[PDB]
Amino acid sequence: GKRVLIVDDAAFMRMMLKDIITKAGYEVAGEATNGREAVEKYKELKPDIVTMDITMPEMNGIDAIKEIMKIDPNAKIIVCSAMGQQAMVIEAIKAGAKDFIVKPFQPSRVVEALNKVS
Ligand SMILES: [Mn+2]
């Protein structure tokens, strides 16, 4: 679909993403501030896509990807990374992420990835 669950501990970052995802025609299923919170809302919300930050408190993105992958082996997760987070990117993808997006955000590339993932 086009209902995106946004997860990032940085509010600024969520809002920005949120702005892009909308202008692009997607829909904001909801948000989450950590890995545990993510897994939860994945469960309630059942979104079509998840954008997942890597460095977060309580549970990291990888932790939470694994979890979700447990709940839903068909989950569609895109991981957001800072530059120089190349290894964890690899890891998240090995974990099950479909793609990755860098921060700060390049909208064209955000949209592209999202489109690909659908
Ligand atoms: Mn973070």
Q: What is the CATH number of the domain that holds 17?
A: 3.40.50.2300
Do 31 and 6 meet the contact criterion of CB atoms below 8 Å apart? Answer: yes
Is there a binding annotation on residue 48? no
Q: How far is the CA of 53 from the centre of ligand 1 (A)?
A: 6
State the Cα–Cα distance between residues 48 and 26, nearest whole angstrom: 10
Annotated ligand binding at 22? The verdict is no
19 is in an annotated binding site: no
Q: Cα separation of 22 and 31, whole Å?
A: 14
What distance in angstroms lies between residue 36's CA and the mean position of ligand 1's atoms?
Answer: 14
Task: Give CA–CA dist 63/39, Å, rounded.
Answer: 10
Three-state secondary structure call for residue 56: coil
Resolution in units of Å: 2.2
If one counts the domains in the chain, the total is: 1
CA of 118 to the centre of ligand 1 (A): 25
55 annotated to bind ligand? yes
Q: Are 77 and 98 in contact (CB under 8 A)?
A: yes
Q: If you measure from the C-alpha of residue 27 to the centroid of ligand 1, how many angstroms do you get, rounded to a whole number?
A: 22
- Number of H helices and E strands in the chain, helices first, is 5, 5
| Whether 60 contacts 35, CB under 8 Å | yes
Ligand 1 centroid, distance to 100 Cα (angstroms): 14
Q: Which domain holds residue 20?
A: 1-118
What is the Å distance from ligand 1's center to 8 Cα?
A: 5
